[PDB]
Amino acid sequence: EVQLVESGGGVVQPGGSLRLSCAASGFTFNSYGMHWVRQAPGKGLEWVAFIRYDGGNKYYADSVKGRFTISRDNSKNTLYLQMKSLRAEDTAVYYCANLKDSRYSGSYYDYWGQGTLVTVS
Amino acid sequence: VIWMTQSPSSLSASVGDRVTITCQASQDIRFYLNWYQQKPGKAPKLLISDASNMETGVPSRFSGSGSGTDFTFTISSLQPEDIATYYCQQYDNLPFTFGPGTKVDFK
Amino acid sequence: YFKIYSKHTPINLVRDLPQGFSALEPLVDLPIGINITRFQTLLALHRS
Amino acid sequence: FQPTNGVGYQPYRVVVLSFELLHAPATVCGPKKSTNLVKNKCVNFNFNG
Ligand SMILES: *[C@@H]1O[C@H](CO)[C@@H](O[C@@H]2O[C@H](CO)[C@@H](O[C@@H]3O[C@H](CO)[C@@H](O)[C@H](O)[C@@H]3O)[C@H](O)[C@H]2NC(C)=O)[C@H](O)[C@H]1NC(C)=O
Incomplete structure (x- = not known):
């Protein structure tokens, strides 16, 4: 029943930008906090960011702080x-x-969702 | 920030063998450690939460324990279907971190 | 402090919540000093 | 212990009251003294804090 679908991946140049989204269904999305996690090829799991249920408090990994922003639209059940x-x-x-x-x-x-690949080069 | 490590980084075992994976924290994460199992092409699956609490649907051959800085994950009888990379995650405080991961291969 | 508020009113509707305003009065304030992040509703089942 | 033992040899009961004050809601407080209520006069007052 519960699904998480990432999208918005692709290939970009260094110094550029890219916005990812995740569509949630099958559960009360607006009751749960959500995380982003990334896994580079040949590497393990790296935690990226967390946003609270109300879309208020935001937390980031030191590796992305100042560059990444996490947000959510609880009316569309979508994480960004x-x-x-x-x-x-x-x-x-x-x-x-x-x-x-x-x-x-x-x-x-x-x-967990399926995972969307983002390449920078 | 709490750093997590795992040992061994890789192990080989046969069917029926006992497999143990050690995970360590640079700080006291209390009992707050999740154990994940990841197979190629798939997202990580949670097997154990809060150091030793088994998830519903997880086979009884899986177990774990520990407190503070030293935690252990065990498979009492390794199956052909248990070949995966296992990760530990601490969630005592933010940011949350994962260990390097331990790869279990087939003898 | 674990604070509980409550209200008890009659209703003649089903499968919804009623329209109109009703404020909840304080019921109890418990000096417990513990962390709460999760909860579960307890139901009574009959041995029959 | 024997009933005929000297003072330093006789048994004594000891109770120790340890007072713990942490960053938490108090669970034990001493009694609060109340005075009589005065009306229709200029007074200082303290009603439950
Ligand atoms: C209920 O949750 C709160 C919030 O997470 C818990 O507070 C946290 O308590 C830990 C210690 O148990 C604090 O860690 C300490 O931080 C100091 C300062 O950096 C450091 O010197 C110590 O070695 C230790 O790392 C943590 O900072 C604190 N979090 C906050 C936001 O204050 C609280 O303990 C939980 N209650 C129970 C019963 O678990």
Whole structure:
């Protein structure tokens, strides 16, 4: 029932920008906080950002702070990641996810999308 | 920031073998550690939350425990279907971090 | 402090919430000192 | 212990009251003293803080 669908990937040049989105359905999107996670080819999982259920407080990884912005539209059940001044090091598959977290998001269930590839070169 | 490490980075085992993966934190994450299993081409699947709480649908052969800085993930009887890279995630404080990941291969 | 407010009113509607305004009065304030991030509703089941 | 033991040898009961004050809601407080209520006069007052 629960689905998360990333889109907006593709190939961009260094110093450019790209906005990702994730469509959520099958659950009460506006009740959960959401995360972005990226995985570069040949690499493990890197946490990128988190936004609270109300779209208020925002958190980012040190590797993206000052360049990436996280947002959400709770009327369209869509999560967004706005990345600007992307570098070659930012090439990765970007996922939207609802990560089980007993301390912050309060999520009791763990959901992941499919992942969208963003290439910078 | 809390740094996470895993050991071994890679292990090989056969069917029925006991497989253990060690994950360490540079700080005290209490019991706040998620264990994920990722197979090629797929998003990570959560197997264990809060250090030792098994997720619904996860086979009884999977288990884990630990507190503070030292955590262990165990498979009591490795199956052909358990070949994957396992990750630990800490969520004591933001930013959240994942360990390097431990690859389990087939002997 | 775990604060609970409550109100009890009659209703003649189904499958929805009523229109109109009604304020909830404070019920109890518990000096507990714990963290809450998740909750679950408890239902009663009969052994029959 | 024996009933005929000297003062320093006799048994004594000890109770120790440890007071914990952390960054948390208080659970134990001493009693509050109240005075009589005065009306129709200029007074200072304190009603439950
Ligand atoms: C309820 O949740 C709050 C918020 O997460 C918890 O507060 C956190 O408590 C930890 C310690 O248990 C704090 O970590 C400490 O930070 C200081 C300063 O950097 C450092 O010197 C210590 O070594 C330790 O890392 C954490 O900062 C604090 N978070 C906030 C926002 O204040 C609280 O403990 C939770 N309650 C319970 C019962 O778990």
